[PDB]
Amino acid sequence: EREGFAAEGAKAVYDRLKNGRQPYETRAQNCAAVTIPSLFPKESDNSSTEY
Amino acid sequence: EREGFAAEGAKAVYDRLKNGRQPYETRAQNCAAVTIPSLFPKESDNSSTEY
Amino acid sequence: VYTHIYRQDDEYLRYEEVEGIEVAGTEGSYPLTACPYIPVRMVRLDGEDYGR
Numbered sequence A, B: 001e002r003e004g005f006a007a008e009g010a011k012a013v014y015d016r017l018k019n020g021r022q023p024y025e026t027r028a029q030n031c032a033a034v035t036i037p038s039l040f041p042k043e044s045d046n047s048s049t050e051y
Numbered sequence C: 001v002y003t004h005i006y007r008q009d010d011e012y013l014r015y016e017e018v019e020g021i022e023v024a025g026t027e028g029s030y031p032l033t034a035c036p037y038i039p040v041r042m043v044r045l046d047g048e049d050y051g052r
Helices: A010-019 A022-031 B010-031
Strands: C002-007 C012-018 C028-030
Touching: A010 C002
Parallel strands: none
Antiparallel strands: C002 C012, C012 C028
């Protein structure tokens, strides 16, 4: 009955581990700004963003 | 029962002989900093370090 | 919708969850060498998740 690794649910494991990706996204955003700015967009972009 | 060369366990030998490798590591780090600085990382590095 | 895959006793298990409950009919099991999810890295270091 969901003993190990699954005793708390799916939306709970996803929120604890979400803070480990922080350096990689920042470093990729720094890389993808002198070659193609539209290759790696942020997570807060919409129709009005200009590259 | 594990006679000579084996009279103090596996962990005791490792920590005693660990001290002989220091010059080689110190020299390898100097060598691997003008060619490619991410080929010989130290033993105390993590996701935040920058090369 | 969320999907969860975890290791238990030399195999893999899965299920699917919506809202806050579990959708019936989505359970399953995969072998230890035929998981159809493939994380890929380019440059691999020692002791880190993900890749450079």
